[PDB]
Structure formats: structure tokens, C-alpha cells
Amino acid sequence: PIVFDHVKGAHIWDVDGNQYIDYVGSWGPAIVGHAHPEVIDALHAALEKGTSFGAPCLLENILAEMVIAAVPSVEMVRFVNSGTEACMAVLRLMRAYTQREKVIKFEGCYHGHAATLTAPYNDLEAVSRLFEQYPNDIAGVILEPVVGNAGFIPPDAGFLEGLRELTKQYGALLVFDEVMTGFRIAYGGAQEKFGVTPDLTTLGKVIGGGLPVGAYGGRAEIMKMVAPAGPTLSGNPLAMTAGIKTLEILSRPGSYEHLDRITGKLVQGLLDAAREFGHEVCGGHISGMFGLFFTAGPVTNYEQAKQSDLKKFAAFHRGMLEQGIYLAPSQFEAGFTSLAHTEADIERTIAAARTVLSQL
Amino acid sequence: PIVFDHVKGAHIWDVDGNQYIDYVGSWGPAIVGHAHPEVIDALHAALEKGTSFGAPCLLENILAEMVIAAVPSVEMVRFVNSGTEACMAVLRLMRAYTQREKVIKFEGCYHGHAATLTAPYNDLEAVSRLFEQYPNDIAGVILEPVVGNAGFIPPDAGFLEGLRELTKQYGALLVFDEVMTGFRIAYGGAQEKFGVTPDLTTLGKVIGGGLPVGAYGGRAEIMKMVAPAGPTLSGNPLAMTAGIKTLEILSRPGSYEHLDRITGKLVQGLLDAAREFGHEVCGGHISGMFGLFFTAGPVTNYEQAKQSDLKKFAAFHRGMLEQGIYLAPSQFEAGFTSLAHTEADIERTIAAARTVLSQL
Numbered sequence: 001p002i003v004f005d006h007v008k009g010a011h012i013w014d015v016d017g018n019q020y021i022d023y024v025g026s027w028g029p030a031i032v033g034h035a036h037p038e039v040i041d042a043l044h045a046a047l048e049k050g051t052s053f054g055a056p057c058l059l060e061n062i063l064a065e066m067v068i069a070a071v072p073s074v075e076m077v078r079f080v081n082s083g084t085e086a087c088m089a090v091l092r093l094m095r096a097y098t099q100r101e102k103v104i105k106f107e108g109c110y111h112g113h114a115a116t117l118t119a120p121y122n123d124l125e126a127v128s129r130l131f132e133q134y135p136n137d138i139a140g141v142i143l144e145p146v147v148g149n150a151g152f153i154p155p156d157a158g159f160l161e162g163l164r165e166l167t168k169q170y171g172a173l174l175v176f177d178e179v180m181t182g183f184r185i186a187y188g189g190a191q192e193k194f195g196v197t198p199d200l201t202t203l204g205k206v207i208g209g210g211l212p213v214g215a216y217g218g219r220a221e222i223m224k225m226v227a228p229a230g231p232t233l234s235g236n237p238l239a240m241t242a243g244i245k246t247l248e249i250l251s252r253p254g255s256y257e258h259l260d261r262i263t264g265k266l267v268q269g270l271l272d273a274a275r276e277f278g279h280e281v282c283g284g285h286i287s288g289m290f291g292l293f294f295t296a297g298p299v300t301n302y303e304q305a306k307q308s309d310l311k312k313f314a315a316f317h318r319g320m321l322e323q324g325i326y327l328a329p330s331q332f333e334a335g336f337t338s339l340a341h342t343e344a345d346i347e348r349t350i351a352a353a354r355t356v357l358s359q360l
Numbered sequence: 361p362i363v364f365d366h367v368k369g370a371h372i373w374d375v376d377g378n379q380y381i382d383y384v385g386s387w388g389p390a391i392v393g394h395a396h397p398e399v400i401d402a403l404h405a406a407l408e409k410g411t412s413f414g415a416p417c418l419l420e421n422i423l424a425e426m427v428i429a430a431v432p433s434v435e436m437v438r439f440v441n442s443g444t445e446a447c448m449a450v451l452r453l454m455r456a457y458t459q460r461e462k463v464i465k466f467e468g469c470y471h472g473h474a475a476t477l478t479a480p481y482n483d484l485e486a487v488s489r490l491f492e493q494y495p496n497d498i499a500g501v502i503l504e505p506v507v508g509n510a511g512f513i514p515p516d517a518g519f520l521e522g523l524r525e526l527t528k529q530y531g532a533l534l535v536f537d538e539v540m541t542g543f544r545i546a547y548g549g550a551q552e553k554f555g556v557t558p559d560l561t562t563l564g565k566v567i568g569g570g571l572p573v574g575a576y577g578g579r580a581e582i583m584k585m586v587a588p589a590g591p592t593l594s595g596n597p598l599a600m601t602a603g604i605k606t607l608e609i610l611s612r613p614g615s616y617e618h619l620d621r622i623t624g625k626l627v628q629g630l631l632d633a634a635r636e637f638g639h640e641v642c643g644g645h646i647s648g649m650f651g652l653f654f655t656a657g658p659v660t661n662y663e664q665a666k667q668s669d670l671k672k673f674a675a676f677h678r679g680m681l682e683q684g685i686y687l688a689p690s691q692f693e694a695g696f697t698s699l700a701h702t703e704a705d706i707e708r709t710i711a712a713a714r715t716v717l718s719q720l
């Protein structure tokens with residue numbers, strides 16, 4: 001039951017007056033730090049033109065071109081109200097485009113809240129088998145290119161390259177869900193970082209600068225199908241104003257190198273500190289996204305993540321909270337660093353970690 | 361393709377510099393007028409504490425108690441991210457509570473985007489029959505107490521009283537969806553205005569003051585079931601800040617009388633002006649919610665609404681746009697007036713209407 005008062009930079013203050021160091025980021029968006037002054041200013045201005053329109057505005061476009069420019073696969077993009085909604089648009093789209101019904105998801109992936117086949121994450125064979133069996137009926141494969149909702153699970157070597165081989169081979173689409181990895185893993189998203197291009201991509205979190213928003217885009221020939229007649233829902237103007245400022249900041253020199261730096265230090269420290277006291281653990285980070293499981297693992301999929309000792313985590317979590325550190329409450333949510341986080345912030349976090357871990 | 365620049369009061373300005381009179385309200389929320397200065401101020405302040413927390417805050421409570429106080433059925437309330445989400449929470453809830461699976465919806469109703477039975481709106485018999493047939497398996501009946509997404513269709517005499525008779529009679533719940541009618545039809549919502557109390561209610565639009573938000577509430581014994589274990593999703597703090605200010609304004613003397621006044625004048629004018637030129641039409645308003653169908657009707661249900669001459673409406677709509685009036689583009693969306701609308705605003709709207717209608 002922890003109740004916030006305000007947040008700013010890499011910190012959070014609660015109703016009792018406790019300051020913490022944030023490793024949640026409002027669950028993704030806060031990549032340039034909470035209450036960034038330039039964003040806040042942009043908003044004070046925008047605010048005076050209306051919190052909400054219900055119809056489109058020029059901001060949509062400015063953002064759109066920033067997005068198209070930043071993400072490879074994206075040649076055309078559409079904005080909606082949430083990432084969930086974007087994932088739904090994108091599923092309707094795969095199907096209309098391919099004129100096929102079945103879609104492949106991975107167990108552990110989260111895209112919001114038989115025509116579905118699932119497989120386990122990082123399992124290139126199981127997928128291949130689903131195609132061998134439904135050669136003409138898979139519209140596509142949708143996934144988080146880096147998993148953040150089953151803990152933090154990166155893609156194995158060749159996994160995404162494999163997904164792009166099969167989809168091509170069977171005339172099916174490769175859809176990436178980058179609501180979370182978008183602009184976080186890299187400016188170009190995970191697609192750009194791993195140099196694999198899907199046919200469609202979903203976007204959100206960061207691009208709303210902390211306000212709710214979503215987007216879907218990809219190859220033009222596909223997106224053209226989103227036309228007047230099959231298949232009020234436009235981008236909130238404040239959300240766009242914040243999205244635009246946020247990306248501007250991110251595209252300055254040093255951003256992504258900074259995230260990598262602190263997050264490596266952080267994950268590594270955490271890993272050192274647990275093993276400093278005989279705990280079996282493993283984890284990692286990519287850019288500003290990270291995780292640590294209480295198992296030796298490693299974890300390449302959800303059933304493996306479910307190996308984690310939840311009683312330890314619970315304890316660690318509660319311990320870290322008293323040490324002035326705010327980590328996601330579940331072992332199955334990944335962590336996030338921001339551009340506000342300082343190397344000093346990270347050491348304190350490690351200190352905390354050691355203090356806490358040397359008592360379980 | 362009409363693109364907004366800014367909105368304020370009862371007006372909208374587009375990217376070409378055209379001012380219009382708004383009868384959309386950002387599809388519901390803008391009841392006290394676009395960009396209300398007191399709301400805007402409240403937001404400038406709130407803004408500086410963070411656009412988004414991801415966790416709860418005191419504002420949730422302040423709003424909650426304002427809501428409980430305002431809506432009868434609501435003894436306990438929970439906030440979520442959208443009205444859609446609230447409708448989903450509420451459907452999970454009906455079912456857990458009753459330990460039954462089937463739910464009754466009406467054809468024409470919209471609650472966002474066999475365990476479902478439908479009936480036609482205002483059809484008290486068809487419902488009764490569904491119970492006679494599934495006596496022990498209806499969790500409840502969910503409806504818009506006033507319909508705004510099939511055009512504007514109010515409840516017939518005895519309809520809601522009938523729904524409250526049957527639900528009781530068969531141990532099933534009566535759920536009102538007041539995402540739209542909430543605080544618009546009356547401060548207490550349509551439930552309070554028609555003096556019928558459901559077991560559960562959903563809320564949104566207005567209570568987010570133009571930012572996205574949702575809520576569900578009702579009898580305490582039911583809500584207690586929303587507990588730690590079956591069945592990040594908290595209210596955005598800006599949304600709450602705006603919701604709170606918005607209701608404060610609404611609870612000042614004169615608000616709802618003002619809405620009734622202008623909207624009657626408006627609907628009536630529109631009706632007079634069409635018939636002034638031999639068009640078959642009908643419609644009405646309740647408080648700041650109204651509609652006009654191009655059929656003689658009357659319309660008590662969706663199939664009846666579907667009688668409307670869409671080619672006329674289309675023409676009227678396009679005509680009104682050139683006359684500086686902004687009505688919802690579909691015959692099947694209801695209209696909305698705001699506290700900013702002036703009697704002058706309404707006459708101009710009628711003038712427009714006459715000019716336009718005397719040319720089809």
C-alpha cells in the first residue's frame with residue numbers, strides 16, 4: 001500500500017515524506033526522468049490550448065514523422081489511446097492483410113488486456129512446427145523483441161532472425177510489440193538495435209511522455225489497408241507534446257550510452273552483492289532495461305523465470321524499500337533506469353542491495 | 361478530415377483558422393467548457409509534481425469521496441485508466457459476485473472495445489424472457505441508462521424500474537454504465553435523476569476532466585470482493601486533479617438548470633427548423649445530452665434509430681460545418697452542450713440549422 005506525493009528526476013516522494021530512487025519509471029514512459037523541466041514547460045503551454053480535442057491535430061504529424069524517421073519498419077503510423085489498443089489494431093490488421101486467422105504469441109508475453117497458438121519464448125522450433133502444421137493459416141507472429149513482463153528476458157542468438165525467416169517463408173507477418181522497448185532499448189527500438197525489421201510495430205509508453213498514448217505502424221502497403229471502411233480515437237495533444245519533447249531529448253548525444261553505463265554497473269553490482277552472500281541469481285540489462293531473477297537460471301523463457309524464489313524476492317523488495325529503493329513489486333516486471341539517474345544514485349542502490357541481501 | 365488547433369469554452373478553432381460552436385465536447389468530458397481556467401490552473405500546479413505516478417496518490421481519495429457522495433449506489437469505488445477498462449472490471453465483478461456466467465446487453469449499447477445475451481433496448485419483455493429461460497445463470501444486466509451511442513435514446517417509462525425488478529427477482533445484478541451519463545444527466549448521474557439504484561456503476565469521461573480515466577463502484581459487499589487476489593492500474597494524477605475541479609464547478613448553483621435550458625431551446629429549435637421545411641424528424645435532450653434523428657420515429661431502440669436517413673444527416677452535417685457548427689459526424693452519436701454555451705451560441709446554431717435545412 002505505498003502512496004505517492006510527487007516524483008521528479010530519478011526520485012519519488014511518498015505521503016509520509018520518504019524519498020526513494022525509482023527503478024520503475026511509471027512502468028516505462030519516464031525515460032528522461034520524472035518531471036523533466038523542458039517537458040513540463042512544453043506541457044504548460046499546450047495545456048492552454050486544451051487538454052483534449054477528440055479529433056486530430058498537427059502534433060500528430062510532427063510526432064509521426066519523428067517516429068517514421070526513428071523506426072525502420074515504420075513507413076506509416078497511426079495513433080490511438082493506449083498501447084493495448086495499438087496491439088489490438090495491429091492484430092486486426094495482420095489478419096485483414098493476410099486474410100488468415102491464426103496468430104502466434106509466446107507464453108510470458110503481454111500485449112494488454114483456435115485463433116491463438118502460443119509457444120514458449122526463445123523456442124524457434126516450436127514456432128517452426130506450428131507453421132509446418134498450419135502452413136496457410138498463420139497471419140503472423142507477435143512478440144516483445146525483449147521481454148519485460150515475465151521478468152526481463154532478452155532474445156537468444158538467432159531467435160528474431162529465425163522469426164523473420166519463417167514469416168517470410170510462409171507468407172506471414174512479423175509484428176514487434178515495442179510499447180516498452182520502443183525508444184528505450186535504442187532510439188530505433190529493439191528492431192533497430194538487433195538489426196531485424198518486422199512488418200509491423202506497436203509503440204507507446206515513452207512516446208506519450210508519461211501521458212497515455214499508443215501507435216502502430218509498418219510497411220506502407222500494409223498500413224494503406226487502414227482506410228475509410230474496415231479496419232474519435234486520435235492522440236491526446238498533451239501526450240503528443242510530451243512525446244515530441246521526450247524524443248528530442250533522447251536524440252541528444254550521450255543518452256543511450258548513459259543508460260547502458262549506469263544499468264550495467266547496477267545489474268552487475270546487484271549480481272555481485274547477492275553472490276557476495278551465497279544467493280543463486282542471474283540477470284542482465286539492455287540499455288535502460290534490466291532484471292535480476294532469484295535462480296541461477298539462466299532465464300531464456302517464462303517457465304524458467306517461474307523458477308525464481310519468490311519468497312526471497314519479496315523479502316529483498318521489502319528490504320530495498322526500507323533502504324530507500326523502489327523496485328517493481330513483482331519478480332516478473334523488468335527494471336528501468338532514466339537519464340536522471342546518476343552514477344552516485346547507482347552506488348547507493350548497490351549499498352542498499354548489500355545491506356539487504358546480507359540478512360536473508 | 362478536420363484538424364484542430366485549439367479549443368476553449370464552447371468553441372473550436374481549426375488549422376485553417378475557422379471557429380466553430382462545439383456540440384461534441386471531446387466526446388463527453390468537456391461539460392464545464394473546454395480549457396476552463398480554474399481547471400487549467402489546477403493542472404499547471406499538479407503538472408509540476410509529475411504527469412504520472414504508476415502508483416496511487418491522495419487525489420484518488422479526494423475524488424473517491426466526492427464520487428461516493430454524489431452517486432447513490434456508489435459506496436466504494438476503484439479507479440482505472442479508461443471507461444472501457446472500468447466496464448471490463450465491472451463484468452468480471454458481476455460474475456465473481458454472482459458466481460454466474462451470462463450477462464444481458466442491449467443492441468445499440470456501447471461499453472468500449474454463450475456468456476452474452478442481448479436484447480433490444482427499452483424491451484422489458486425480451487429481458488424477462490431471458491430470465492425465465494436462464495433463471496439461475498444471469499449474473500446481471502448492464503446498460504447505458506440513457507443511450508448516447510445509437511443516437512440518443514432515453515429510457516421508456518418503467519423500463520429501468522423493470523430492470524431493477526427482475527434483477528432482484530432472479531438474484532442478479534443491475535449494472536449501469538454511466539461513463540457518459542455520469543455527472544452529465546445530473547450530478548448524481550442518471551441513476552439519481554430517475555431515482556433507480558443499480559448494484560454497480562461505471563464512471564469516466566467527465567470525472568477525468570478531459571484526461572483519460574475510469575471508475576467502477578457500488579454496494580460495499582460487492583466491491584469488497586475486489587481484494588488482494590481475484591479480481592499498476594491507478595488513476596493518473598492530472599486526470600484526478602481535473603476531475604476534482606470539474607465536479608466542484610458542477611456542484612455550484614445553476615449548472616444543471618443551465619444545461620437543461622439551452623439544450624431544450626437547442627433541440628426544440630432544431631426540430632422546429634426541420635419541420636419548417638417538411639423534413640420528418642424527432643429527438644430530445646436530457647440535461648446536456650441530446651439528439652435529433654432524420655425519421656419521424658419516435659426512436660426507443662436501435663433498429664428504430666437505423667431508420668434515419670443517413671444521406672440527409674450527412675448533408676445536414678456538412679452544411680452545419682460550413683455554417684460554423686460542429687456536430688458529431690455520425691447520426692448515431694448524441695450531442696453535448698456545456699456550461700460555456702450561451703443562449704446567444706444556441707440561436708446562432710438554430711439560424712445555421714434553418715439556413716442549412718432549407719436547402720435539402
Ligand SMILES: *Cc1c(COP(=O)(O)O)cnc(C)c1O
Nearest residue numbers: 082083084110111112179180204
Ligand atoms: C504496458 C504494455 C502494453 C500495454 O500498453 P498500455 O499503454 O498500457 O495500454 C503493451 N505491450 C507492452 C510490451 C507493454 O509493456
Ligand SMILES: *Cc1c(COP(=O)(O)O)cnc(C)c1O
Nearest residue numbers: 442443444470471472539540564
Ligand atoms: C466512451 C464510452 C465508454 C468507453 O470509455 P473510454 O473512457 O472511452 O474507455 C464506455 N461507456 C460509455 C457509455 C461510453 O460512452
